[PDB]
């Protein structure tokens, strides 16, 4: 699916990402946008032979197993294909386990290159939430 800015904002909010581990909602909307361009079926093979999956680009080497990846720790205990749905529940729940580890949101490179230190509350100003 390709979401709209406020459409996504309201759904991340329904799943509890507003202020999850103190990251305001706009942080999440902004990272969906520079990771997947709001497209839930986004998939990107990475030089190390792993693939990033779904709207928050969760990686198969650590977070989900997809069969094809050398060393899959599968820490979210999820099939990577579960992340290509249009129901964001499983991509959110694993995002909650990624952001509770050490680096918070810095896990996502696009967030800490395009969102961190900008007015991310702009991604939700205008939405009915």
């Amino acid at each position: 699916k390709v979401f709209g800015r406020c459409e996504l904002a309201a759904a991340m909010k329904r799943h509890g990402l507003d202020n999850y581990r103190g990251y305001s909602l706009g942080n999440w909307v902004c990272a969906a946008k520079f990771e997947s361009n709001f497209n839930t079926q986004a998939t990107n093979r990475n030089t190390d032979g792993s693939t990033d999956y779904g709207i928050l680009q969760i990686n198969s080497r650590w977070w989900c197993n997809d069969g094809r990846t050398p060393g899959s720790r599968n820490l979210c205990n999820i099939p990577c294909s579960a992340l290509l749905s249009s129901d964001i529940t499983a991509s959110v729940n694993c995002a909650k386990k990624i952001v509770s580890d050490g680096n918070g949101m810095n896990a996502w490179v696009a967030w800490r290159n395009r969102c961190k230190g900008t007015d991310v509350q702009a991604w939700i100003r205008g939405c009915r939430l």
Epitope: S24, G117, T118, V120, Q121
Partner: antibody, heavy 116, light 108 residues
Framework: QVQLKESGPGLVAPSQSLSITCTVS????????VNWVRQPPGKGLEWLGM???????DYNSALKSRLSISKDNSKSQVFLKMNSLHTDDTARYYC??????????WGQGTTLTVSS | DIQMTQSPASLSASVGETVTITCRAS??????LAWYQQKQGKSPQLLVY???TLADGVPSRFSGSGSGTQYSLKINSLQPEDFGSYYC?????????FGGGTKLEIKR
Amino acid sequence: QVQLKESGPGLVAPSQSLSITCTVSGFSLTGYGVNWVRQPPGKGLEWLGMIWGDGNTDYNSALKSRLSISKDNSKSQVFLKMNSLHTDDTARYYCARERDYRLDYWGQGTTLTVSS
Amino acid sequence: DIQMTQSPASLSASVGETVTITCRASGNIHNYLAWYQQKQGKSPQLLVYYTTTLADGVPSRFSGSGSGTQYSLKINSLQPEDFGSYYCQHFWSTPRTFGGGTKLEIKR
């Protein structure tokens, strides 16, 4: 360990211009915005302006013509310049770190007295 | 722009009392409210952000509340170390504005 220290000129004459530096240590200026707040002796806090991690700056509506903010990322330095000073800008001037819509680390302050 | 109306200006209460401070906004600020405590001649320090979250290291006797335009800071069983000034600040767009302050003072 996050530190914000501001350095001003202490006393300055009315109608001249003021530059205060705020040097930071412990975070990169690219990733956090820094605010400038000030407190007149025996008065509340007043927001002056900010510069976001990406360099965009915002200001108090009413002091917009007099304030100008900028920063040198390399140097870890934010700069505040006021102009057309009046005895009313006699206050303690603080810079604060902003980390996702809360000012979480403040500096000690620098007092500025504007007198002839 | 949005202005904050803090109330009361000053408040006398005994240690162990439970006090409640109030900020009212001229617009919906959508829970982007922070509260700062300032002790005698010290830099303010962050207490509650995004309306209800206690900052790192802050005690459980402190609790933020509100939505839209009416926000509150409740302090329960006041300690000696809680007297001083309290400021709210909104964070909905720029410019940000602080309320006036509430000076919590020891009743005697």
